[PDB]
Design a binder for this molecule. Sequence first.
Ligand SMILES: C[C@]1(c2cc(NC(=O)c3cnc(OCF)cn3)ccc2F)N=C(N)SC[C@H]1c1ccccc1
Length: 374
Amino acid sequence: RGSFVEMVDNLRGKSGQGYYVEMTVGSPPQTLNILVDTGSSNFAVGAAPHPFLHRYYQRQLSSTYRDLRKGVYVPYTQGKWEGELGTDLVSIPHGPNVTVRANIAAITESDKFFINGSNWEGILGLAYAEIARPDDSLEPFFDSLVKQTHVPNLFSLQLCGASVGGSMIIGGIDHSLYTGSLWYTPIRREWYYEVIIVRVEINGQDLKMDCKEYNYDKSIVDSGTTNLRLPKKVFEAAVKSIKAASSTEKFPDGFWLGEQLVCWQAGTTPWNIFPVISLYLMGEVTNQSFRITILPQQYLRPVEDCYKFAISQSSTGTVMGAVIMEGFYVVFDRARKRIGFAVSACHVHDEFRTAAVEGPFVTLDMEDCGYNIP
Ligand SMILES: C[C@]1(c2cc(NC(=O)c3cnc(OCF)cn3)ccc2F)N=C(N)SC[C@H]1c1ccccc1
């Protein structure tokens, strides 16, 4: 507990291409780089020579492979993958020293799934059974890990932005990875990592919307998404306020919609003109909340000095992607059904402002901020 030297820095990636951990599948062990995804629940790996791939799972080489003789078809709006379900022995070399029999979806056809130029060849879905494909009977990797070993029902993520790195601490918390205190928000329901936003501020100025709008139709913590995604009505309000606070320089309308990049001369980026963004989350106690605050260093991300505005509209509710997660050490405390936030020791800041986790605050009717099907 508290110190996990061997797991520090077990994550790498390229900007906008996600955060991956090294994993082994089969006997003898086949090494693969696997994207860490808190927004899905399948362990799914390339199993065929797709041209984008550095390597792939070769089931014929593994003596411990067991065929489940079942297909799986996984469409999304963003793209698709399909595969063949089986089990095999899985371990994480720079994680806990254990071997687990886990479900593996062997990917045999895909579209807009793998990224051309990326260094990963699979996905680790870290969310709950309820959103696993084809159904909730397919046990997720982390569920198998906890059931079969003595690894505690907890993991934490420190994602470090602006070639990227970070840590996945499996089974615990490393105190060197954060400054100040952890503050916990309850996991509303165990499917996605669902949370409730109770208040939103831009430079400490309340957006003054019905808090139900902030969570329409849900709010989730998702390492497999880049942007801070906000529901349409919230996005419009937030951008209006962001435009106002930054109005000392005018930018084209397309920039705020992510249709254009904006550029400055090397080293001259005017961070000071861009507001901080605060999300208040439901606390552990009745009428008690806490606030997480991110900088422009989190929401304006380098494209390679040119930047993309990485807050965008959603029809799937709030998505707290890498834009949020790069500011914070995030503790997915599955055993206590809660998520902890603390200021990340690796978050990108300047001499004037840092990311913040602050509380307690007094907020009434926080339960009403949750959305239910009418
Ligand atoms: C399953 C899925 C998914 C996500 C990613 N993500 C990334 O590439 C990525 C890139 N940058 C990030 O931060 C900054 F580095 C974070 N992540 C890659 C493949 C992938 F399957 N997970 C979701 N939670 S939402 C779309 C969904 C999806 C499903 C099918 C096709 C495409 C995406």
